[PDB]
UniProtKB/Swiss-Prot annotation:
The chain holds residues 53 to 415 of 595 of the full protein. The modification N6-(pyridoxal phosphate)lysine is found at residue 91. The gene is TD2. Involved in defense against lepidopteran, but not coleopteran herbivore insects. Acts in the insect gut to degrade threonine, which is an essential and limiting nutrient for the growth of lepidopteran larvae. Active against both L-threonine and L-serine. It comes from Solanum lycopersicum. It comes from the Eukaryota. This is Processed threonine dehydratase 2.
Amino acid sequence: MSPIVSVPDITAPVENVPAILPKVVPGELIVNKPTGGDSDELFQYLVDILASPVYDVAIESPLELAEKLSDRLGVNFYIKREDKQRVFSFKLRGAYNMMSNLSREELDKGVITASAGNHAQGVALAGQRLNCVAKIVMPTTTPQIKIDAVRALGGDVVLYGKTFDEAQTHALELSEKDGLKYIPPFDDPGVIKGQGTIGTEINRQLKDIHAVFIPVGGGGLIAGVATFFKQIAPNTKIIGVEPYGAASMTLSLHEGHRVKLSNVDTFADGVAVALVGEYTFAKCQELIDGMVLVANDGISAAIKDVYDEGRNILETSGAVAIAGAAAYCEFYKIKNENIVAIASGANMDFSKLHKVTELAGLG
């Protein structure tokens, strides 16, 4: 696309109501017919992804064979463990890549974003490595322990607003006012290329993949991974996964244009996105095979699945793609194929397991 700099959003509003969802069961593929994208643009992405300095902050995370899930489903079920990054999610990658491309002058001024979660941690970490002040704007109502999490990384946290939107608005206007570069959570080529490095790793770690399942909030992660994969392993399906109650990418792809959901279920907070990105929606139209929807009980059961493997806890958004991959395997009776799901993060309040156990128990 082109960069959207100053105009307010005018994306067509859609009332988020059960009657609008495609009538599919969990794991049933909502088909996308990819348009292909541009050869030169994709090539530029490939090279930028390969040149990305993410390893200044990130590791090549494990691609782990999930034994129990594999035995149950009769496939080779692999989980890409981005929850094993320093900040417990993949988001250090995009943030560092984009920030590392800023001029030394821009970095000396300092950067700004609004977040009290996974993106905030990635940005703060990148700020520390790049020796620059990152101002993270959070609502005044933010649990002290998350403020400390970001301050621990060296973030200059600022309290403002009662919701993420007011904090965000304030961070954005404070951006134009103070002349600070805004670091976007997903809607940016630099960020997309950072997340794309996960495609490189997965492909390096495993060939002959039937499908890679990827959680979709804003669409940065999937756009990045799909960009690498559709050039390097074109026969592999790239499938996005979303909660029924937050199906903004699915609805957008179905309508043929971005769509703004009136409200979203927040159980999977990281993917509770009302409006997908401009760059990322275009990449999905161009590249991905389709979308799969999951419910909160399926998400919760996936958290239990991973616990049952090694007693690690994923956050709800981090388990979304696992739920999607598993459901897809059962729906299509996939057998003896390689399946990858991305475990995208593990920053969840301990107390949320109260609700998760309740939903996981439904079987």
